[PDB]
Amino acid sequence: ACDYTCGSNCYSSSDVSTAQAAGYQLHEDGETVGSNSYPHKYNNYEGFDFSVSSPYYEWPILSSGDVYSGGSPGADRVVFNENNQLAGVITHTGASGNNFVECT
Incomplete structure (x- = not known):
């Protein structure tokens, strides 16, 4: 399970x-x-x-x-459109200017 393990965090x-x-x-x-x-x-x-x-x-x-709602996520950040589908899990820290990039 957990196919989005970013920052060493096997997310489900x-x-x-x-x-x-x-x-x-x-x-x-x-x-x-x-x-x-x-x-x-x-x-x-x-x-x-x-x-x-x-x-x-x-x-x-x-x-x-x-x-x-009361903290600071940043880094991990799954994308989507308007149907809760799933564009992909991108990270906001593993790239200059925490750019987004598929978790690898």
Whole structure:
């Protein structure tokens, strides 16, 4: 199981989906979290090979705390579009300017 082990953290790809509907439910609800709109749309440029849609989105995924709301996730950050599908787990720290990149 856990196919997204980043920073030495075998995250469950099935658990990432739940957190995937976390930043999504908010993006579609129009509401927001913390106070800076965490769930936003990612344009992508590095060089991925996702196969979902164009209008991606970013939101932090956790496996112990809970929905991002009172702390600082950063680094891991599964992407998505508007159906809680899954663009891929990208990291925001393993690349200059914590750019995003498939967890490898």
